[PDB]
């Protein structure tokens, strides 16, 4: 179970913050991932973070726009998207691995999915 | 995107449909970490296959996964009405990067 | 009775010869064998000992389900004579999901890290008693070499890392005499990510070849001066890089100042050592997976940046067979220090889905100045005959 | 090659660090492991050994049924190196439903009680041979520390008890040299019920912290002078009592002289030692059941009556896991004696009805002068995967 | 240095529990050897248990028809006392009859194998075979199925060749460092000497044996090692120790001749002398090997037909099976202590719900102090076993 | 500290039973290694058993298709003599052929592994690798599969590389403390040397080997370790010792050439000299490795084709399988004693009721005294085995 | 298992009930005494382990009931002095099925007696 | 401890009897026993240690605990199950506490 923030409307050029918290047990060693789905389009992987290490990874097309932060004590991940443009209107999901970080589990597996948040950027 | 998929597929109730997902060597190929997700309209994506062949608990055994060279395949045997959905393939491209494929819209007749 | 100084020359190495094999997976289908991962060989002045990070279960057991996890409270360090498989009569010397064992010539030193990931405890045990302990200094995950440490004149050096595996991490070198930490030293040099070092004595100091998980497909070298407690760092100048995720031989590169940034995002433990300007190096045959294992010698690979001249190649494990961690250990001879390496053979899940466990076997080779031949020594267990 | 004096000071203890673990129940689902209860750890000058009271059967056996009984003629004392599980190669040193053991620097002394409850025999085995024997003096269940005794300069102090577990009982202290009882001393002081003492050397004498099974939740203290053969007794002054049946932290009380009459009833074997004025102790987290185990230091708990100031709390076993007995032992260091404790982890019947047997595992911690971290070390055996 | 056993005998007021091997209980869920006729011999450091294993485990197909005692696959098994006979034990020699000795420097094993008509007794010292002898009567060449004594490097082993229901040639062999230095025919009034329990009585050796022809009163053999002299007698105590015997009222024993008093079969037993009194062990039953008690008969080593009994201990209860019994001496700080082992036979020819025949041991030692009561049977549920 | 073997040879009137390992009987109810080609070598304290064990137990699924002898998972297993090869054994090296010896200071193990085309022989001394050699003829590089002999710190090993049905390159390696100090080609009249059994005959070493090309009589290699000189001949017995042989009426030997009498194959055997006589152990059967006898041939080391036989002992009866046999010497207190081990092969290619192939050992030692008769087979019912 | 016969007593007297267990040695077991007034429920008077000879009583029965035992005969006696009018009831003797131990310290009540009625009268 | 005064049930159905108490009573210790007493007969133990059941007792009786209330469930109510039912618990200091008794009556 991953709870997520509410849907927020925004103006172009502003900055939005999306939050997702895992209720579960203690998930700091687990890997969280952020996925964007434009209305009608497919899924694109923005990036990921292990809250324990606090060293995010980003896609090549999202380096410079997305900031991913985390709180390991509360196991809550945050995604800040700045300089909102027209094609940032989408639904944002946060996923989490079912296994902790290890030698054989280093890729960001995405097993448990959140409900998603919509961000509308237009005016 | 980086992984290619059929735009749409159709099938009859009872037959089996294979969804393909092709990519380069850095994509599906080496690094046999291929996941298949299923998304019904208006709901979040659901993992149905992880690690090419493995399947999570609670997923129907009718869904199977396989890999051949540089392509992956998702086989649905015994199509029903609840299998009408968008199916997505993702892979680990290396250097802590995940690559998705454009989803296929499986519709049963 | 007296300390170990390693004050002998490194004798001539024309290759490596088979030394030992533990058919743990083969014996475990019709026997009682521990489920282990991350082994290493450390030799006291009389004989050699094998060490493993067990999982608190045997293989023909219900608790072998989901053994792929690496940090588990029931993991213990298993000690045996080299050649004796890990049966029910083994000794668990400490609780650890990360360990490092060495012998100073008088007793054994074990460094054992256990507990929570955010707050872990590293216990230093000497002569059968706990002598020291530290906690995490960065609170990410506290790790050690997972191979043997090096003790010179009673001072033992352990490389311990704490921080991100995909980012900057605080790596320290701890100098311990008789189980008590007398010094700590931050990592200094051009290396940017140091993990799971394989260390060997190069008198008067210690030389370690380690694993980069952030940006380096080549291996960092840490040189430790045990009298001044000083640390310097660099990379391997051999163009043929020795990390499992790597480019092909044509496109690989290593200028031994910075990470090559090719596909360095993971790796294996690995090992390398220097013979004059040349480098003896062992890596896996596959460039993306941990399948296969070769060793060879690169001419001027410790002195000339980006050297791809290869001689004396031996196929320890063939391409079609799985491999794993590989590490180094030094054995005193009559008049020289001889280098030897251990190779892990991982059998189990995340590659083989017909079983539920994940265990290993070990194959140990030693250098020789004489003539050798060719061969093949995989794990060789039929996975369809296993529980 | 000479006697042990324990003539060194005590370590500076800021807490405890993980030392050893025996995954006996996990290994017994697919292995040959003795069914045991009431273990302890005693260390010779070289290493440390684990002792258990085995039921004369393995876990995967038909004779594991109705194991919950505590006094059978088939119970033996099992001796092993610390870390080695109790497998078929274990040595049964004596017949005992209750036992004690020390090393005097030359050999091992084992005190072993067997026979009938009406008429019991306590044998004293020194250096592999039987030297002396005593019988019951009150014609009740003759018991013993069920832990180590203190072996000072060839003189051994074993606390035995004979009498009711809900009334007045005759408790004696036996002084033994080389297997021969040289003195007997009745218990003297304000302690009214003494059972299963955990004893440690406090030079020139011995300090024991025991359990009270009659009107007491605070633990009795027995101080033994081995030169005068004299005994004094009191109660732990720490306010936070350490018996597994007890009142909550608000309503608990412990004055120095008399038992507190606060949920006296049953008890558990525990331990506590002194830090000048502080007290280091360990107790079960649960207040009615033996579930969980924590250790902490109470400020001015050995001097000020009913002092409830707590610092340096560690969670050895979480509340959702089954604990059991616990006990202290002492390890001679390079310059000063260290204190360590073992915790029993009971798995089996009278609480878990899915199995018919009753056995245990052991987790051993040692004191450290350095930094540590948080963690959790339960048995972690899936009771649904066991025979 | 050699063992002399030149200390006085310890003060013995009884016996105290010392060791137990729950082999049969452990063998239901483990790989334990099938053994019979064990003994305990102590080197200067520790004590060792010896057994005549049948070359098979209990949870095995080769445990069928194990009641035979003379098989080519029988081997002598050594272990530390208390360690069960698991798969990591050492088979020191091939033997269906064996005797182990420690002289202070090394071990000596007398091991008999071969055919009944032509048997070989091998004498193995310090891990190597040093001597060998053959049958002198071409009957079953047997030996003491227990330990015997080495004084000043000279070890005395009693061997018997001949009928078990008639006259048999019994010879005492004196061996130095694995080499037979002397042999001596049995001399005295004993008419049938089978396997003995021997203990040092400085400067010589005293052995209490079993009679299988016409006696049930435990013949005594005294051996002088200096001049290789043998004398023989019986136990003067009326309370006889052989398992086939009549009741205590009609039993009789004069120490010149066998009593002709339900002689028949016998069991391995033990008795030793404390002054004029005798400390002896026997079975509770009078026809079967069920139960075991030890007691002291006053004036039982001097006065013929003495039936005054004190200090009775029930080692094994009447309703539980027993077997062979034997003595062994442990050197203390200032006195030699006597200890005894008791066989606990579990298996076929009495219990027909299984097919094998194996055993356990319970070992007691003498004490000068106070003891209590108890009962230590094997306690294995025969319905819960292979 | 070094061993010189300067003592004389013991007077030998026969052989006596020393040790037995009931490995096949125990493996039906336990975890026992699957082994073949074992041997016994004795350090100054005790004796050790060595086996070329494949990486599997007998109750395992990997026991299928065990009949292969050159497998990468084969390892050399050490144990104390008498202890079965259980899961607690030590794998000292990787080898499908090995030779172990003790110089009085440490152990030397020669272990050959790898491919048949290219093989590596490693030399482990005192627990560490000291030297390595490769194939010189690129055929299967083999070794004695028995114990080597060390005199004054110089250890002698015999390694053959070549064809088993033709001329092969046999070399003698002289090794001091794990390092090859000399190599000597085989010289003399022997034309095929394989699997030698070597014993110290001071000042040199005498080896009796297996001929696989043209000889039913056994080659003899005499090795002088001072000047590193090799001579060779054949046994002058006439009662030839190789398993494929003609009957006693048609067999022959003339000390120089192979007799060309059914000598197309062979078994590992042994023979040693007692002056002009020869003590020799062979199999009872003339075509199969079933049964094993030992005897003494009068004037067998001196007179060509001497068919006079005395002192015959049946070690294994002819109705029971046998296998490799080998010699090893034990230092006594006055003289060197000779002892021999016999393989007992149980498993496939003769017994198709199972799928594996393993062995047991029976070890006998020479004696100056008397002995008897008997038989000591493996004695495992193949119908009760997994 | 066997108890004494029914006893007729006048108020102010003292009654002695007995309970002997047969079938082995039960000195180390726990024997308890239970009272049942006619038509009312079960009340636990108190227990004893005959080996230890230290009885335990309920809060409402202390000072009135004396429980003694003979471990050799495994017999437990209950003496009830000051026989007040409402002391008429049926008295049961019960025994634990398990001997005293670390995990068995509470007075289990497994094997029950047949009962004995005492009647405080006139 | 507190128990219902009386219960009634039909033949063939399942009934449940509750036993409530304080923390020192049922709720802290797992020593809860259930006894069955037919009229004119001695009490008979049917449940000990909350869930455990003696041999010779019908499998239809199933004890259970949840919080500070123990429950006895009788499935397949037959006519021989008409008896008084008593719950007992360990008080905490060598003391047992009983219930009041439930008069089960089948119809």
XYZ file of C-alpha atoms in Angstrom, chain E residues 31 33 54-57 59-62 72-73 75 87-94 113-115 117-120 122 124 126-135 177 179, chain F residues 16-22 25-26 28-31 44-45 80-84 86 330-331 333 365-367 369-381 384-385:
84
model
C 22.773 -42.567 11.431
C 26.167 -47.761 14.249
C 28.295 -54.836 12.667
C 29.376 -52.731 9.686
C 25.969 -51.098 9.296
C 23.748 -48.350 10.667
C 18.206 -47.118 9.739
C 19.562 -49.444 7.085
C 18.668 -52.569 5.159
C 21.709 -54.410 6.522
C 33.480 -60.665 8.733
C 32.146 -57.079 8.770
C 34.860 -53.847 13.455
C 29.386 -41.989 10.797
C 32.561 -40.137 11.823
C 33.839 -42.834 14.161
C 37.088 -44.734 13.688
C 37.228 -48.462 12.937
C 40.585 -49.324 14.507
C 40.572 -53.043 13.597
C 38.412 -55.884 12.294
C 38.691 -62.292 13.161
C 38.625 -65.100 10.628
C 36.737 -68.382 10.675
C 37.901 -73.128 13.099
C 40.844 -70.890 12.128
C 40.927 -67.475 13.808
C 43.526 -64.705 13.834
C 46.055 -59.318 15.787
C 48.058 -53.586 17.231
C 50.598 -47.318 18.455
C 48.540 -47.419 15.260
C 50.475 -50.258 13.615
C 50.139 -54.038 13.642
C 52.905 -55.466 15.813
C 51.960 -59.102 16.307
C 49.567 -61.858 15.306
C 48.630 -65.263 16.698
C 46.373 -68.083 15.560
C 43.973 -70.455 17.245
C 54.649 -52.741 23.141
C 54.907 -57.915 21.061
C 47.132 -60.475 9.215
C 43.919 -58.415 9.132
C 44.499 -54.758 9.956
C 41.596 -52.562 8.855
C 38.277 -52.558 7.028
C 35.964 -49.774 5.856
C 32.372 -50.919 5.287
C 27.218 -51.127 3.608
C 27.145 -47.774 5.411
C 22.771 -47.354 2.125
C 21.844 -45.647 5.403
C 24.136 -42.637 5.453
C 25.996 -39.987 3.484
C 55.165 -41.565 11.602
C 52.169 -41.489 13.984
C 42.192 -41.473 9.153
C 42.435 -45.187 8.420
C 39.141 -46.668 9.622
C 37.040 -43.503 9.319
C 34.565 -43.775 6.415
C 31.552 -39.054 5.239
C 55.205 -48.988 8.069
C 58.232 -48.193 10.213
C 60.686 -50.304 16.219
C 49.716 -56.161 7.296
C 52.600 -58.599 7.464
C 53.355 -60.524 10.626
C 53.810 -64.755 13.953
C 51.007 -67.162 13.156
C 47.538 -66.491 11.760
C 44.429 -68.262 10.497
C 42.034 -68.361 7.547
C 39.037 -66.259 6.627
C 37.366 -64.078 4.036
C 36.637 -60.349 4.153
C 34.508 -59.229 1.203
C 32.591 -55.990 0.826
C 29.458 -57.829 1.950
C 26.785 -55.335 0.915
C 23.490 -56.611 -0.466
C 19.144 -52.957 -0.427
C 21.110 -50.102 -1.978
